[PDB]
Amino acid sequence: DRELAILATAENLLEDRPLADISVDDLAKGAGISRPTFYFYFPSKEAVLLTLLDRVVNQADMALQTLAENDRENMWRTGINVFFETFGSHKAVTRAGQAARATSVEVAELWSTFMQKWIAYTAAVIDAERDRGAAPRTLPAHELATALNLMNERTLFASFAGEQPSVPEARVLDTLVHIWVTSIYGE
Amino acid sequence: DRELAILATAENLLEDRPLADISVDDLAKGAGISRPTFYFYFPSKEAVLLTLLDRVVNQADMALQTLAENDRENMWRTGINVFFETFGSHKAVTRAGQAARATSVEVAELWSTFMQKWIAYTAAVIDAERDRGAAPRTLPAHELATALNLMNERTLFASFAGEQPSVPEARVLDTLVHIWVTSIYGE
Ligand SMILES: CCOC(=O)Cc1nc(-c2ccc(C(=O)NCCC(F)(F)F)cc2)cs1
Ligand SMILES: CCOC(=O)Cc1nc(-c2ccc(C(=O)NCCC(F)(F)F)cc2)cs1
């Protein structure tokens, strides 16, 4: 209600400046409520960022669940694309959420929990490919999955933030798919 | 002289706690000098971290230069190992240096400059392998190099910091070598 207005305001202002340059007053005004009324919905502007991150992460996670319930290069591209499209459609929340991992235990634990879930799912699919005889038994599945997932995190987020260096955003999906498919099917 | 004593003290204390919990007084005492005498060597404790990072980065860079001046899987392992051994022998400087990228323009620009140099060198070697007919013309060399270099940054540093998730430090070199060799030589 007013909660959604606070979240939308925060996402809107995060496109213009860091969380340190947004005050509870900024969020309050944007949602058409007083400052004390803000504190009824959220204990802090940091709790607003945590909720936004939690929604984007859960949106990615549900999209990956949807794929899982329904050629091999395209299978991997469709999974990587969940993360490219989801985080890529919420760049300001991605950037601020990643920056808050340094200062918020709750942001670090949220990120850590979902990365563990996505790595376990990556490993399970590599194992299924190995059991069906399509992928060779090279590295331990979970170790290969961990490095591929951490590559995606750093490479996607560097591209979205226009970092130097970074893969251009128009080339990053193809770049990651090549490295996943060659490292999973290669010996 | 006293400069080396300040640097050693800072590296020693960074193993115990973050830069925010080290004062110019801590560094001063460790080097056997007063606080005003500290300010003769360094403008700030942040300048001390920048100098430590600059030495570790230059040590990696010179070790890679040494390899470059002198089987293909082992060639790649020896290059990746420069970064594993160099940053892995200076874990506290690695952790604090990476954290300071968020708050120091000079740390961000140092990191960015050397990453660009290592990516350009990675691309040049992939191109040489393609020109000699050993590697296939798949992705653009510089884009493949960028993603592999960013994978190494995130995966090495997560392993060194014992992050959850992370590849165990005893498995990370083999993990990265597999992903480099399969993605560079694979189609
Ligand atoms: C039978 C269906 O199989 C598939 O759909 C293919 C599959 N893809 C994944 C997958 C998991 C994580 C990431 C990723 O990018 N992690 C990093 C996330 C982050 F946000 F950090 F970038 C990319 C892909 C698992 S299985
Ligand atoms: C003829 C000689 O060829 C060789 O020696 C093999 C070669 N290896 C590299 C190489 C460059 C960067 C990194 C790396 O890990 N970057 C990331 C650095 C960071 F610190 F971020 F981890 C790893 C390997 C270039 S060419």
B157 and B65 share a domain?
yes
CB atoms within 10 A of CB A127: 15
Interchain CB distance below 8 Å, A183 and B187: no
Q: How far apart are CA A42 and CA A116, in angstroms?
A: 27
- Using alpha carbons, select from B187, B125, B119, B80 the residue that is nearest to residue A155: B119
DSSP code, position A16: T
Q: Closest residue (by CA) to atom 21 of ligand 1?
A: A153
Domain-ending residue, one of B27, B44, B61: B44
A35 and A53 share a domain?
no
Measured from the Cα of A87, ligand 1's closest atom is 20
B91 and B179 share a domain?
yes
Chain B interface mutation, best of A107, A155, A164, A174, highest count of B Cβ atoms under 10 Å: A155
Resolution, Å (one decimal): 1.9
Q: What is the CA radius of gyration of chain A?
A: 19
Burial of A117 (0-12, 13-18, 19+ CB in 10 A): middle
CB atoms within 10 A of CB B105: 8
Amino acid identity at A141: A
Q: How far apart are CA A163 and CA B34, in angstroms?
A: 40
Chain A residues in contact with B148 (beta carbon < 8 A):
179
The tokens describing A158, both together, are 């560097």
Determination technique used? X-ray
Domain-ending residue, one of A44, A62, A79: A44
Q: After which residues is chain A broken (C to N over 2.5 A)?
A: 70
Q: Are A45 and A27 in contact (CB under 8 A)?
A: yes
Q: What is the CA radius of gyration of chain B?
A: 19
A40 and A77 share a domain?
no
Q: How far apart are CA B39 and CA B27, in angstroms?
A: 11
Q: Are B143 and B74 in contact (CB under 8 A)?
A: no
Closest chain B C-alpha to A29 CA, distance in angstroms: 29
How close is the Cα of B174 to the center of ligand 2, in Å? 14
Residues 6+ away with beta carbon under 8 Å from A18? A96, A99
DSSP code, position B19: G
A50 and A36 share a domain?
no
Nearest-CA residue of chain B relative to A141?
Answer: B175
DSSP code, position B43: S
Q: Domain of B12: which CATH number?
A: 1.10.10.60
Could you say which ligand is closest to the alpha carbon of residue B155?
Answer: 2
DSSP letters, B72-91, are HHHHHHHHHHHHHHHHHTSH
| Alpha carbon separation from B96 to A22, B10, B21, B49, B123 (Å, rounded) | 26, 11, 12, 8, 29
A101 and A120 share a domain?
yes
Interchain CB distance below 8 Å, A179 and B183: yes
DSSP code, position B42: -
CB pairs under 8 A between A and B: 111
B85 and B37 share a domain?
no
Say if ligand 2 is within 6 A of residue B180 CB: no
Q: Indicate the residue of A115, A140, A176 with minimum beta-carbon distance to B147.
A: A176
Chain A interface mutation, best of B101, B138, B146, highest count of A Cβ atoms under 10 Å: B146
Interchain CB distance below 8 Å, A143 and B115: no
The tokens describing B141, both together, are 């060399």
- Using alpha carbons, select from A19, A18, A16, A17 the residue that is nearest to residue A42: A19
Burial of B56 (0-12, 13-18, 19+ CB in 10 A): middle
Domain that residue B26 falls in: 1-44
Q: Domain of A142: which CATH number?
A: 1.10.357.10
Q: Indicate the residue of B153, B154, B186 with minimum beta-carbon distance to A182.
A: B186
B58 and B34 share a domain?
no
A54 and A2 share a domain?
no
Element (H, E) at B59: helix B45-69
CB atoms within 10 A of CB B34: 12
B154 and B86 share a domain?
yes
Which one of A69, A118, A183 would you pick to mutate in the ligand 1 pocket, going by the greatest count of ligand atoms within 8 A of its CB? Answer: A118
Length of chain B: 187
Interchain CB distance below 8 Å, B187 and A182: yes
Q: How far apart are CA B71 and CA B74, in angstroms?
A: 6
Q: Are B141 and B130 in contact (CB under 8 A)?
A: yes
CA quadruple B35, B37, B40, B46: dihedral positive or negative?
negative
Q: Write a three-state SS string for A46-109.
A: HHHHHHHHHHHHHHHHHHHHHHHHCCHHHHHHHHHHHHHHHHHCCHHHHHHHHHHCCCCHHHHH
Q: How far apart are CA B164 and CA B52, in angstroms?
A: 27
CB atoms within 10 A of CB A186: 17
Interchain CB distance below 8 Å, A138 and B178: yes
Whether the bond between B18 and the residue before it is cis, its omega within 30 degrees of 0, is no
Could you say which ligand is closest to the alpha carbon of residue B176?
Answer: 2
Say if ligand 1 is within 6 A of residue A80 CB: yes
B79 and B61 share a domain?
yes
Whether the bond between A140 and the residue before it is cis, its omega within 30 degrees of 0, is no
User: If you search the block for the tokens 């590697």, which residue do you land on?
Assistant: B135
Domain-ending residue, one of A44, A59, A76: A44
Give CB contacts under 8 A, 24+ apart, made by A181-184: A181/A72, A181/A73, A181/A76, A182/B138, A182/B182, A182/B183, A182/B186, A182/B187, A183/A144, A183/A148, A183/B178, A183/B179, A183/B182, A183/B183, A183/B186, A184/A76, A184/A126, A184/A129, A184/A135, A184/A144, A184/A148
- Using alpha carbons, select from B94, B65, B64, B67 the residue that is nearest to residue B158: B94
User: If you search the block for the tokens 């990365």, which residue do you land on?
Assistant: A115
Nearest-CA residue of chain B relative to A139?
Answer: B175
Say if ligand 1 is within 6 A of residue A180 CB: no
Nearest-CA residue of chain B relative to A170?
Answer: B143
A36 and A52 share a domain?
no
Q: How far apart are CA B73 and CA B169, in angstroms?
A: 20
In chain A, the number of structural domains is 2
- Using alpha carbons, select from A119, A111, A117 the residue that is nearest to residue A94: A111
Q: How far apart are CA A73 and CA A180, in angstroms?
A: 9
